[PDB]
Amino acid sequence: YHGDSVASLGTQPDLGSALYQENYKQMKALVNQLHERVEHIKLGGGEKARALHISRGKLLPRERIDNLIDPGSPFLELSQFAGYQLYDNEEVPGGGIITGIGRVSGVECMIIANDATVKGGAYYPVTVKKQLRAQEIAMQNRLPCIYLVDSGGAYLPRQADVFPDRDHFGRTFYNQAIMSSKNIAQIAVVMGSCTAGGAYVPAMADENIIVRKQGTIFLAGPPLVKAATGEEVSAEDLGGADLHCRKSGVSDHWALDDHHALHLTRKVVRNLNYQKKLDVTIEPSEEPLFPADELYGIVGANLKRSFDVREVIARIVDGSRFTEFKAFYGDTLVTGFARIFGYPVGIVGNNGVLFSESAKKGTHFVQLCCQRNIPLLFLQNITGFMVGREYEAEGIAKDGAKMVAAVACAQVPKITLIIGGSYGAGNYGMCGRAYSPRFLYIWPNARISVMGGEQAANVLATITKDQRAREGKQFSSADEAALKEPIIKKFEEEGNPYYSSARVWDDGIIDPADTRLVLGLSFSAALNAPIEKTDFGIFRM
Amino acid sequence: YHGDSVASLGTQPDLGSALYQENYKQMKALVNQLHERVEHIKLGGGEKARALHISRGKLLPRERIDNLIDPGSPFLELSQFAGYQLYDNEEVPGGGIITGIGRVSGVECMIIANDATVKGGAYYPVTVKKQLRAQEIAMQNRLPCIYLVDSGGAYLPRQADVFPDRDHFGRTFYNQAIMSSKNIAQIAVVMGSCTAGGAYVPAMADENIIVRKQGTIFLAGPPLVKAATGEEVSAEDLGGADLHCRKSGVSDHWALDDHHALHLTRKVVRNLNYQKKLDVTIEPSEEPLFPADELYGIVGANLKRSFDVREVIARIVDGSRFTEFKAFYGDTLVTGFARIFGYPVGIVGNNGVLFSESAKKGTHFVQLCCQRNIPLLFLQNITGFMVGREYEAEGIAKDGAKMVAAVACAQVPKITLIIGGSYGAGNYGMCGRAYSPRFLYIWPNARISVMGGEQAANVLATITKDQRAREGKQFSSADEAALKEPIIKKFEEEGNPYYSSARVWDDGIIDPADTRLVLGLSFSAALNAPIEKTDFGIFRM
Amino acid sequence: AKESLCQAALGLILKEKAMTDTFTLQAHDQFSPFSSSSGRRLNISYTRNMTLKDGKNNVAIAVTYNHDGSYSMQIEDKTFQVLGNLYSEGDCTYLKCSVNGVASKAKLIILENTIYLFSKEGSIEIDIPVPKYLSSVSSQETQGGPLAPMTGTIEKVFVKAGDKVKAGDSLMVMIAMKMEHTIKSPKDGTVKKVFYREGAQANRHTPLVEFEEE
Ligand SMILES: CC(=O)SCCNC(=O)CCNC(=O)[C@H](O)C(C)(C)COP(=O)(O)OP(=O)(O)OC[C@H]1O[C@@H](n2cnc3c(N)ncnc32)[C@H](O)[C@@H]1OP(=O)(O)O
Ligand SMILES: CC(=O)SCCNC(=O)CCNC(=O)[C@H](O)C(C)(C)COP(=O)(O)OP(=O)(O)OC[C@H]1O[C@@H](n2cnc3c(N)ncnc32)[C@H](O)[C@@H]1OP(=O)(O)O
Ligand SMILES: O=CCCCC[C@@H]1SC[C@@H]2NC(=O)N[C@@H]21
Ligand SMILES: O=CCCCC[C@@H]1SC[C@@H]2NC(=O)N[C@@H]21
């Protein structure tokens, strides 16, 4: 029996209001700017590299991915803004690698492809970080992965950042071994020459496909062999699809053109013999009752103005149906249950500065969801944190610890979205990047940093004032603005969404309009991994 | 998504070719001969025993089996050629017992019935072997079993081969206890008198049904009681359906005629409350693209000529669709994935003399299938084995050991078919009888022995030549053919398919035409047992 | 003509979407957004390019999966604004679609390798490509030349130095050490010459007869 009608969230924002107009204009400006940049990134290494790559007869990586996936299906690229102005003068579109999740032969699987157009497929440090992030996502979600190797090797001028360290290059192979150990499939496809970077990968993978001419599997390149052993020989003699197939046996299959390799890959995936099963109650799904684009006028591009979360929730969940939990108590925070694309979810969001009561409410909600095996989604807009003499007297920090412990010990899949400004230890509290959320995204407006620039400028001013007063020449009235200005500027630069997305702190920058769609895709993939028991540490009263 | 088209195996053999004509004629001759013999076996003990068995009002065993199974359903008799000319002068059709697998009340179950027509239902040594083989098949496949006892007792003139040894008679009861221990059902139905052989069986089984008059359950027969205790009394007083039912309680049900017992058995099977569940992905099945009878002209009745396996595979698998694995490397052996009756299978077959590379390929393939929980099927035509000074220098024996270890440690169901000549240690390598395959069949042409007769004759000639030369009178030029001839003759006699099938080394001799159908039935039954983890020993590099 | 090519190209997607839909129905989860045939990427408009056989000339059609569900295809600098659907009258399915504001209904019978458009005014014939690897021509290109699987005495060769080659004809019969096997001609091209004469022996994976380039 499901005949009871339920109240729906959200209202109709006043379009005629000048505030809505202003917010809309700001959000359009940001979205347009993002779109133009993404176009320029997708062009890749540049026209000349494309001309040469075509001249060899290979297919450009974007074309390869389009042919590989089940046609007419969505594909979810990740961290497209990697390496955006990260290095001093070297243009590295997309980090010289394309990674994503797609549906192939009816089974979700992660695709990782080199981009030989960009810098000959050399592994920049960011490239390794991006690839490892993809692999860990696949393992947690328990998804098969496919590699499309056209890489040369590690970037020589930066060897310290690539080779030695634990999380550095080579950890890739370790993950590969662990994946194959616990039945997660591995497939490697070779389209280009490889020198010790794409040489172990086919040997490391269970299955192997190599194109007849353009594919060569060799541990040491012809220049490396010539320089090291004093002997020169073409990589085909060390590599080659036919040469390796007849005698070496490294290649399990022998393809002629790029299309043939893709088709064979589809056949292998079908033969993989895996079936997905769910363990959560499912229901029919319906669209939210309100248009999504209104969010622009609701949110704007200023962190100062405040927007109620429930408006956004109405714009997202199925049918705009929501059941708030302990609404009156701890109003600064919002929790409740909802359904997205027929899947149950628990929504946690921020309205204002946290207090002790909000922390207690969040802890109780987390326990409930973990007990009932319900996925969790976080919408954090932490304009301020819990600071105050009365607050610390009653151990508001202790309540914050309760947030941290509950979030950390949780085992159900967790997804986080940074709708608004994130600062302070609340990032740790509301399932930050460090707390291993399955995904993480940021809207084009959000700014993330440890503290607002003004706060740090004031704090530094005071500490210098106190110590220099102890030194006899206190921080003078002059230099106050001179000292403050650089701190504000630097914090602004480090808080920019592109700046963080240049590194891999986030999985991607998404416009608000696409939000709903992305979430559904993510949750579907996350459901592949079976749910497990959640065990909690000591709950300090 | 399953829209990609797949290449299909097999071609059209040239019918007009004289070789095809010759091969067809040979195969027809063999099949006709087999059919006539099977007719003569099915007549049973002979007209007079049939007349007497009818006179008592009982139904002949074949009639009983036809009535018992769900009507209009296939039934798979096993080892029909047991005892074929095995003994010196005693005709024992079908080993005096009929065993098989059938579908009753929608549930697969094994039927074992005595044949009181043949030698009063005495247990010849072969009879015990056949019955025990059936029981072990049922336990591995985890199937309920039903007994139709009309036996007198062990054959007195051969008591050494029946009573004492571990695998001898009485082990039946041990298997029965183990089966009932782990919830595998047991049903016993009594139609004839029993003396200590069919006396424990009803007591050993959970359920019991006995016909009113013709059924008597008694541990000691009237002649045994009279000779032993000096007291004579009819077996009805010791047995009897009514007598045992009112007081002894050995009989759980009381039937009037043979039909009534069969009907009650159906009711019990329905009440058994078992449901079959699968754990493998299933797909719609379609017929192979080529007629099966062409195999005759393809194969013939000469071991010298060679036929490519892929022709046979095209004649078997669904839609003649196949995906070869590592085709170019180790070409003498063939492996790949296919689907039969909607079930995934891994095909392993032989084309020629094994080498080291083929062994490595087979080991890798076995690991893959075991990891993905895919059943395995073997088609062995081992004309020759791996022998050679260069081969043994690189440890080709070691690679053969890798074959042995991988096959032995595997836990997925395995089925083997001897399409062609089997010799040497390769029998051990390709899942021989000793390696506990769930089933095993031989075509009418195949010959199995440790070594070809010519090889053994040559080896014996050399060893006698060397030792007698050491003795001063070497193996002369004379007697060479005189010594060779008996060895060739004896090896030919021991290699005959009927000779092996007279014993229980194989589960049956099947014509090539029926091949596909039989396989499907076998695999379906094998799927009842849930799949388990496969653990591998030390992989000697 | 140009619109007709677009109409068929739409039909392939609709059939493919429906068959994509069918496998979803038997699946456990028929509710995921993955089952949607939107073909949408993140922040990018997905485009796939076709090739369809049109009598003598092949035509390349660029299909951009528009954001709203409209369908955009372009052939020789002419763009076409296409929206369509599939509905079945009786047992036969009609294709109803509008191209640049002009709509019509036509029977859509789809064979293995041919496209059928049936209408009152006439019919249109379009042919789908067949991949060369699926065409088994690639199978003959896997091996450059014939190879002898095992070393053995060549009894006799059926083909002379210069001789016509037929499909299925045997190059020679080679018997060795408890094995006779018959070697075939790898390709139908006329033999350049035969490498090994009668009574000779060739090792594993060794050329046997030279063939002219096809
Ligand atoms: C693991 C190791 O340390 S071994 C590393 C040494 N081996 C190599 O990588 C050899 C160079 N790379 C290759 O040739 C690869 O086999 C290929 C075929 C995939 C690259 O193909 P190509 O594009 O023809 O190679 P090419 O040298 O032209 O690469 C283009 C650019 O990438 C750079 N590059 C490519 N690989 C590397 C590398 N491993 N280290 C540093 N730079 C590299 C080159 O400096 C070159 O400079 P440019 O981008 O300013 O023109
Ligand atoms: C397990 C033990 O060792 S207990 C000792 C064995 N006890 C007996 O079986 C005593 C013999 N009993 C019998 O005569 C029969 O088996 C009966 C009465 C139980 C039923 O058998 P029937 O089908 O009626 O056969 P019938 O009694 O007409 O004739 C006996 C035939 O069976 C054979 N036979 C049956 N049981 C045995 C046996 N245990 N040992 C040797 N021969 C036997 C006899 O050789 C005889 O052969 P035939 O077929 O050439 O005539
Ligand atoms: O006169 C000698 C006959 C042997 C009698 C054996 C006795 S009788 C009761 C008991 N049961 C047997 O099987 N043997 C003993
Ligand atoms: O001349 C006849 C002797 C039979 C040879 C059998 C061959 S030799 C190599 C291979 N190993 C075997 O055991 N048998 C075959």
Exposure b/e, C2-27, CB count within 10 A at least 16 = b: ebbbbbbbbbbbbbbbeebeebbeee
Token output for B296: 């005759």
Chain centroid, CA A304 distance in Å: 27
Coil, helix or strand for B202? helix
CB atoms within 10 A of CB A254: 24
CB contact under 8 A, A245 and B360: no
Nearest chain C residue to A79 by CA: give it: C42
Give the closest residue (by CA) to ligand 2 atom 31: B120
Best residue among B195, B216, B219, B234 to mutate for probing ligand 2, ranked by most atoms within 8 Å of CB:
B195
CB contact under 8 A, C65 and A257: no
CA of B224 to the centre of ligand 3 (A): 8
Q: What are phi and psi of B114, to 5 degrees?
A: -75, 160
| Atom of ligand 1 lying closest to residue A153 CA | 39
Exposed (0-12), middle (13-18) or buried (19+): which is B455, by Cβ within 10 Å?
Answer: middle
Q: Is the dihedral of CA A55, A56, A58, A60 positive or negative?
A: negative
Give the closest residue (by CA) to ligand 4 atom 15: B384
CA separation for the pair B446, B302 (Å, rounded): 9
CA separation for the pair B282, B5 (Å, rounded): 19
Length of chain C: 214
C41 vs A contacts (CB less than 8 Å): 74-77
Nearest chain C residue to A63 by CA: give it: C48
CB contact under 8 A, B14 and C168: yes
CA separation for the pair C59, C2 (Å, rounded): 10
Helix, strand, coil share of chain B (percent; to 5):
45, 15, 45
CA separation for the pair A357, A399 (Å, rounded): 8
H/E stretch holding A23 reads helix A18-42
CA separation for the pair B463, B467 (Å, rounded): 6
Could you say which residues from 248 to 287 on chain A have a Cβ atom under 8 Å away from some Cβ of chain C?
254-257, 259-260, 263, 275-278, 282, 284-285
Q: Does B280 touch chain A (CB under 8 A)?
A: yes
Give the closest residue (by CA) to ligand 1 atom 23: A120
Q: Which of B306, B333, B390 would best serve as a mutation to test chain C binding (most C beta carbons within 10 A)? A: B306
CB atoms within 10 A of CB B46: 12
A-C Cβ pairs (cutoff 8 Å, strict)? 100
Coil, helix or strand for B29? helix
CA separation for the pair B458, B471 (Å, rounded): 19
CB contact under 8 A, B326 and A253: yes
H/E stretch holding B179 reads helix B171-181
Q: Among residues B375, B367, B380, which one has the least CA distance to residue B346?
A: B375
Angle between helices A125-141 and A171-181 (to 10 degrees): 10
CA separation for the pair C35, C17 (Å, rounded): 9
Q: Among residues B311, B355, B350, which one has the least CA distance to residue B333?
A: B350
Exposure b/e, A335-366, CB count within 10 A at least 16 = b: bbbbbbbbbbbbbbbbbebbbbbbbbbbbebb
CB contact under 8 A, A249 and B2: no
Q: Looking at the partner chain, which of C20, C27, C39 has a beta carbon nearest the beta carbon of A74? A: C39
Q: Which ligand is nearest to the CA of B231?
A: 3
Q: Which residues are B347's β-sheet partners?
A: B336, B377
CA separation for the pair B251, B210 (Å, rounded): 6
CA of B387 to the centre of ligand 4 (A): 8
B14 vs C contacts (CB less than 8 Å): 168
B333 vs A contacts (CB less than 8 Å): none
Q: Among residues B336, B352, B514, which one has the least CA distance to residue B417?
A: B514
CA separation for the pair B159, C177 (Å, rounded): 48
Exposed (0-12), middle (13-18) or buried (19+): which is A246, by Cβ within 10 Å?
Answer: middle
- Resolution, angstroms, 1 dp: 3.5
Residue A481 neighbours by CB under 8 Å, 6+ apart? none
C23 vs B contacts (CB less than 8 Å): 1-2
For chain C, the maximum distance between any two Cα atoms, rounded to a whole number of angstroms, is: 77
Experiment type: cryo-EM
Q: Looking at the partner chain, which of B304, B331, B452 has a beta carbon nearest the beta carbon of C180? A: B304
Residue A458 one-letter amino acid = N
CB contact under 8 A, C178 and B2: no
Chain centroid, CA B489 distance in Å: 27
What's the N-to-C CA distance of chain A in angstroms?
Answer: 40
CA separation for the pair B529, B277 (Å, rounded): 9
